[PDB]
Amino acid sequence: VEVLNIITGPDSTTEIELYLEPRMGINSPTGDKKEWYGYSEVIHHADGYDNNLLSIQMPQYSCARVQLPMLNTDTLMMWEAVSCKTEIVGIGSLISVHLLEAKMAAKEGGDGPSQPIEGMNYHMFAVGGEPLDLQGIESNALTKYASAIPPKTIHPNDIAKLAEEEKPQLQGLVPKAKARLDKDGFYPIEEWSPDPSRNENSRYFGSFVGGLNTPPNLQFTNAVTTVLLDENGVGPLCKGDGLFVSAADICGVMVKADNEAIRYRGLPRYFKVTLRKRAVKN
Amino acid sequence: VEVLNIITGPDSTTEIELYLEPRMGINSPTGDKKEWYGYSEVIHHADGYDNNLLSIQMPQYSCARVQLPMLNTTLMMWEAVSCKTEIVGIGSLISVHLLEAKMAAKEGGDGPSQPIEGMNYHMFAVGGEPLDLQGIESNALTKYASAIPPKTIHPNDIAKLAEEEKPQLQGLVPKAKARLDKDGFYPIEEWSPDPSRNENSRYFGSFVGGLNTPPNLQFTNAVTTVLLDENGVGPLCKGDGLFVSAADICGVMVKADNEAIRYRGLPRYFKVTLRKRAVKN
Amino acid sequence: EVLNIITGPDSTTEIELYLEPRMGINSPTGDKKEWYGYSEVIHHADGYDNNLLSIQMPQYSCARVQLPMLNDTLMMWEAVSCKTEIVGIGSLISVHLLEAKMAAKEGGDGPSQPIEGMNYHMFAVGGEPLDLQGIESNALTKYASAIPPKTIHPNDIAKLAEEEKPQLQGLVPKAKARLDKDGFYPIEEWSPDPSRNENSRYFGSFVGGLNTPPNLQFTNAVTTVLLDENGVGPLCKGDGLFVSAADICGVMVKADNEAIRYRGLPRYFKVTLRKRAVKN
Amino acid sequence: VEVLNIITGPDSTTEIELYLEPRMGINSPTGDKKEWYGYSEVIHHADGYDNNLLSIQMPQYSCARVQLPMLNTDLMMWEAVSCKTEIVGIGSLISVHLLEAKMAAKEGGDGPSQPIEGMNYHMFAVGGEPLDLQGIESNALTKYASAIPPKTIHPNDIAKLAEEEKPQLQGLVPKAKARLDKDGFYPIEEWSPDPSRNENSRYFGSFVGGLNTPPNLQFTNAVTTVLLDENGVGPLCKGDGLFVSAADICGVMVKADNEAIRYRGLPRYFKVTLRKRAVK
Amino acid sequence: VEVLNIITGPDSTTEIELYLEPRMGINSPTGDKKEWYGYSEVIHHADGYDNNLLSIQMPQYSCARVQLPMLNTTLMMWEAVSCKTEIVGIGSLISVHLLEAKMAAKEGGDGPSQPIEGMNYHMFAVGGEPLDLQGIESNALTKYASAIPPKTIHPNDIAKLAEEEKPQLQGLVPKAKARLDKDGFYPIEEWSPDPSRNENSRYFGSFVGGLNTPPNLQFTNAVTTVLLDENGVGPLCKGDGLFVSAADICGVMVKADNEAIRYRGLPRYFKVTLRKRAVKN
Ligand SMILES: [Mg+2]
Ligand SMILES: [Mg+2]
Ligand SMILES: [Mg+2]
Ligand SMILES: [Mg+2]
Ligand SMILES: [Mg+2]
Ligand SMILES: [Mg+2]
Ligand SMILES: [Mg+2]
Ligand SMILES: [Mg+2]
Ligand SMILES: [Mg+2]
Ligand SMILES: [Mg+2]
């Protein structure tokens, strides 16, 4: 669409708010594993080699489409996302040093606190007028993944369909390994990144701090607004009067006392997005 | 309501100042545990599983309401424009002779104590009404002690989820909402500022986790925090009250005899500048 | 001589590409294809007890992109700005890395050590190949030779006698090259040359050590401006744009002997160009 | 005071420069302990419990009053506008041959010493009256030695709480207030700048704690600190006195024989620029 | 000199570029120790106590005077306005096969070497005359070796304090002053830029200490450092000389056999832009 003038006058703006709950692999507070909702299943070093890596061991992106007030119901209009407030909620919970099943931080014979949540932090949020474009990669192209119908997750080679001999290409950049973030708890973080070659109609912001013992470093405020306008002053334009929000917030890992295996911990993300009416020509 | 013009002229502005003392769990310098005022009770890895987690083992938010000069006695409200805030007693964190603290030296050494280090949780807020809180749990089935009168409130006190439903609290339970309306009552480990409310508050928060992290803190009187939003409107004080809230966990001390920890908190100063703002009811 | 910016329709263009990492195993083909995007294993005495191999030496990526052919006024493409991203940062959360050391005590079943340690990140956009300056940490390191050569070393150009090679631990002005070949110039021997690169813009950071947490951001909301203090960006000779990159994201540690491999990630570039009038 | 116009003309500005030497506890290069000037006395975990903690084990604030050119000879005050401040001798922190310092190597080794590292407390202040101080105790019942005359003042020297009320000092005791009116006298561990006062002072402070943390310090003559408030008004010098205050704990050394520590401080330079301000 | 107008005209500016090679102590790629050019000699904890500390064990400041085009053949001086500067060879710091370096693995492993890490000291200066230095000692009674002719100069070489007064040098001795007037002669561990002088120089310094700290270094040709003071005046080049100074310790290597260290330095590049300035004498 050709983008024309910002529409002025009353009822020219609106605001939408929502939460994305974390999809760390145990994605429902129902069923056998409900006690660990908001965490991954336990991961051991030879998972994906000695056995098939399960979807419940692979933190995934969160996403939602929000229905906007129907436009075009004079001038053809679309909702334009201009700015958002986003917040990781429950950061205070990460002070706990009495984590159930967690390794004790003390010498043998001590009675110390648990190790708290620490280690790799992966934080991303996106706002767009259509689903977020993803690019696939593998750290280990020959990782063994559990297979189900219906699929619980999608892997880059499910799309790229390289033969065993060509799958090492996935440790680099395989142009065919592309997808849209159209399903919540379905695309693993460890295999999918936002695609900087697309996303012309989305904005995304991410940080990663790696390692297993690194201090989680997180801020929270309602005083900071993220501007979603591009260099021409145009924000994401909401196709079908739909706003698409995407998130991933791995806040670290817990370490299990009995075998020192880990689980990822995620927190919910809040979004408040401000939108204005923009005139367009088809 | 509808905000109109900033009121100008003589006595159109005012300033308030106060201290919030830390509520790390031992919240009074009186009684059995008064020696540990400004610290938590000792915490061990199985507390809340093998026993009931005590209110005194849970660092809590500080809060106060400050009465302003009464207005309307043009409708007018006090509008908080800016504040100076400061953590006081940072230099006390240099101590390497902490009472009962683990020695930082090999066996047979005479080294210093481990100083205060590890997880830092710093938050201040200024608002025209109590700060909105959202409940969470790191572990939904943590066992909590029940004191008389009750010393803390927990998210499930409000959500009233059945034991099979409580794992919802590891995510976002919308019913688990409260207002920061009592000093030393809302635990930091279960309550966060609610970003879905707080339209009339400003909050600023930082967390650095782990047990060994260096506390990293600045102090100055040369920095002003602006409380105005994108429209140039600050918090509007309902009932001619200003609400201030804080949490400042500065780290942990480690006990020599069993390597259990206590949180350490420091007091926070606030100076808030306000101006009269015309409003339409 | 640089004249006015060209105005009007079709006065600008955009080009997009990916540079794949060249950490030493530079092809997903042959005996070592399973470690594409990683280096060969490195041990402390490699380059002393044996010849250091090209596959053990992370290298710069580069490509030349053909622009729309230009040519009233003579015209060059001028690189104004770019968006660049490291892609696949999410893959660095893996704690089940094949052959990696276990992060737990003997008798544990803990996760693998994740990728961590030294990060070397550089990107460059230029109207001609990036100028490089040669150095050696250890001037007498032994390097393997092949024909065709898999890498070029500063002394291949400087041609110092063995007694003079210690000069390469400082600054040897003759040890200069141009980044004209992808997966050829080792990071550990070649730096962007600050005495040239008049027609190139480069940006780099290094955080060293073997245990350091990788610290990486990714966004599409940040533009890097390529204009100099006079408002002139890279001017594209032969209607070619030259992009260069190095992204060492850290190392993996082998369970067997605690030897390491470097890990690199691909880098995306989008470069916005405008027509600049020039004279001669 | 009601503040009026800046006074312009010749002789309307002046510049003050001086050094504050560190007061880490060994506050003089004379006497039995002179070898450790610029360090604290050694500190053990049980000091203040098993024995009385000494003034020489407690880093203290540095301060000076500087007399300015007298005004209202026969209403004007000096206004501090800006300052350049520098920690001098930062290069000395590279030493890995510190006297009596723990060796950084395994038993059997001949490694370097541990260098200065761990908790860094850096503060400077410029004001037109003494810096206001608020008292606190990390441990309210710490036992302090009493010298004659007194070498330090403690918060309860002013608050005078009974031993049963002293745990109040682990929070905020409003009675525990003092002015930084004496060099090498106010312990950093018990006194902080009082943010409820200091309306006529500007202070700047950074702390990074722990025993293992790297010192992180900058030095330049290219940065000016502005002392003006939101109204463009700097500190106004009461009685034509400028007050400068500092604390620069750069880290600790570890003793080889018992692993006890001494704090190490460095001297701080100030250049303050002042102008005449009319006042009612 | 009273400073007047910037001189405009076609031949009113010039640009100089040069390298300063590192003086970590082994200061020439010739002689017995040429193999360790760009490093210090090995350093042990008791050096300067059980023995005389050698000049080759003490990182030193680099410096050069560049001859500018002669002016005054009305009265004029070269004014340094801005520079680009760069640490060259940062990529070399990825090496984990350092000759003679400690293995980063358990006994019986075959791990990589420990790479260059630990203390980073980075300083550059541009002046119209030699940089002013202030002397200090971490340990006033360190024993310095005394070569003929001297290979370094020590603060007490200028302050001439008796042994009983030398502890003054752990603070600030006003007499301990020098000018950075010789390449590889002034140890970093004893000499800092003098902030009480250097009215006609600009210096920029950073230090990160410890033995295990990751080097943290950037490189670009997109960053220009402005040398103009508050008044818009850059350094004025006395006798038509430009004075550049540097120190770039990038970390230490750790020896396998006894875990003694060597410092490692890298070369620094300078491009300085100068303009003609009128002055009055
Ligand atoms: Mg490919
Ligand atoms: Mg595109
Ligand atoms: Mg829910
Ligand atoms: Mg809301
Ligand atoms: Mg040379
Ligand atoms: Mg040049
Ligand atoms: Mg009190
Ligand atoms: Mg006050
Ligand atoms: Mg002196
Ligand atoms: Mg001076």
Author numbering:
A (entry chain AAA): 37 to 109, 114 to 322
B (entry chain BBB), E (entry chain DDD): 37 to 109, 115 to 322
C (entry chain EEE): 38 to 108, 114 to 322
D (entry chain CCC): 37 to 110, 116 to 321
Quote what the paper states about this structure.
Polyomaviruses are small double-stranded DNA (dsDNA) viruses with a circular genome of approximately 5,000 bp. All glycan-binding polyomaviruses analyzed to date engage oligosaccharide (glycan) structures featuring terminal sialic acids that in mammals are usually presented either on gangliosides, which are molecules composed of a glycosphingolipid, i.e., a ceramide and an oligosaccharide, or on glycoproteins, which contain mostly complex and branched oligosaccharides attached to amino acids during co- and posttranslational modification steps.
With an RMSD of about 0.5 Å, the ChPyV VP1 monomer superposes very well with a VP1 monomer of the NJPyV VP1-3′SL complex structure, including the region that binds sialic acid in NJPyV. Cocrystallization with sialylated glycans did not yield well-diffracting crystals. While the STD NMR difference spectrum of wild-type ChPyV VP1 closely resembles that obtained for NJPyV VP1, no saturation transfer was observed for the V78F mutant. For NJPyV, this is demonstrated in solution by STD NMR spectroscopy of 3′SL binding to ChPyV VP1 and by the structure determination of unliganded ChPyV VP1.
